[PDB]
Amino acid sequence: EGAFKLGLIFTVAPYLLPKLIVSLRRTAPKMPLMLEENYTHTLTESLKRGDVDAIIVAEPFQEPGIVTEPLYDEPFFVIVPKGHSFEELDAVSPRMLGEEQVLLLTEGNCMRDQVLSSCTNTLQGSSINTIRHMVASGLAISVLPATALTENDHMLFSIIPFEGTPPSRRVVLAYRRNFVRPKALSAMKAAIMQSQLHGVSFIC
Amino acid sequence: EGAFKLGLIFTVAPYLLPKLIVSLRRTAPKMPLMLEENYTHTLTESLKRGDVDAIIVAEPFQEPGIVTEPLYDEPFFVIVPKGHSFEELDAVSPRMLGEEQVLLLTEGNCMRDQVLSSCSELAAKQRIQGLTNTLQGSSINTIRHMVASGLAISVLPATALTENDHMLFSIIPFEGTPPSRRVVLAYRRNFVRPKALSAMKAAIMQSQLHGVSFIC
Ligand SMILES: [Cl-]
Ligand SMILES: [Cl-]
């Protein structure tokens, strides 16, 4: 088979891919990947031009001539520096975060909106990588997507769940209505679905 | 506010930060960090305007009124899909990867040139149709996953190599003298906080990062 071109948003790509490759070898053993990571907007534009075959992005997503399929829901968690007061709380986070310094990802990341919608000087990182290590060092607190949280990273900060129903995002596969590789696409949505990504609720 | 503003290149930040954060809690346990990851040239401009207190970059680096202090050398390794011929090879990779499809980082990554300048059978392809025809990924993240998917082979910095990703591709050593990069600390020459600086170099030197040789 010949290369599928897949684009994933920044806040998803580094976490989904490792598992997508493994389950892709089950579902499309002979199909190489050509991979793009980028902002939703530049990703939509590139898919519209057929520069890229399918992209993984998140609600809200609506675009003429483009089809999306649900993949999974991914809950958010609050992270805080070691010794932050929320360390005493079980899963006590609603919008008690109005009184805290919160790092939000830069504009262009759909993750700024989805946390903002849950609850100039606004402390802000360009990425999860810089945001998690800023928090680790005590600069402030943030909100991360479940799949961005290493089992092994309670050494760096503390993950404090939201209470009740956590804010979450819906990750989806977007592709052109007129796309003409039905087998590659279908093989792709199955690798993702059989991927075994931790921390999410697959949509079935 | 006690906050030290530190910038690091893309191909360094994700691998050094976690350890650095841990060393830093011994050597400046009250110094919070503002961080930026970016391309070298972007980073230098920020250092110069004082938006950032210091930056982590690699050789070659020379800039007027900027000082650098070496931190470590970091070898490169070839990575190849599962089942690639290089897999039964010894540590055989000289530059006989002029014969292979070689993924390389996009323009703005100093790692593009370091990989190039090592080999030359590879600069040839760039001389050809290069710099857009070239087979490239903007990040080590997309590259590692194209190599693992089947797409091609590549050359990676040691500290990017998960001791537990033999699942995805195969790490092939360069024979004899591995090509390497030199990671260094750069700051303006008359920075007012020599103590902040010195705790940074200290925390990095003691970070215990794997696969590098520290420069003492
Ligand atoms: Cl990120
Ligand atoms: Cl540069």
Author numbering:
A (entry chain B): 90 to 208, 221 to 305
B (entry chain A): 90 to 305
Give the published text.
The structure of the regulatory domain of N. meningitidis OxyR represents the first determined for a wildtype OxyR protein in its reduced form. The N. meningitidis RD-OxyR structure was determined to a resolution of 2.4 Å by multiple wavelength anomalous dispersion method using a selenomethionine-substituted protein. As expected from the requirement for TCEP during crystallization, the protein was in the reduced form with no disulphide between C199 and C208. The asymmetric unit contained a dimer arranged in the classical head-to-tail orientation, typical for regulatory domain structures of LysR transcription factors which was first observed in the structure of the regulatory domain of E. coli CysB. Each OxyR chain comprises two sub-domains, RD-I (residues 90-162 and 270-306) and RD-II (residues 163-269) which contains the redox centre (C199 and C208). The two redox sensitive cysteines (measured from the γS of C199 and C208, chain A) are separated by 18.4 Å and are located either end of helix α3 (C199-S207). Chain B is missing 20 residues in total (residues 88-89, 209-221 and 307) largely from RD-II. By contrast, the side-chains of C208 are pointing in different directions in the two structures, with C208 buried in neisserial OxyR with an ASA of 5 Å2 compared to 109 Å2 for the surface exposed C208 in E. coli OxyR. The overlay with reduced OxyR shows that the helices, α3 and α4 which are located either side of C208 would contribute to the dimer-dimer interface in this model of OxyR. Therefore, the formation of the C199-C208 disulphide bridge which involves a disruption of the α3 helix would be expected to alter the dimer-dimer interface and hence the quaternary structure of the OxyR tetramer.
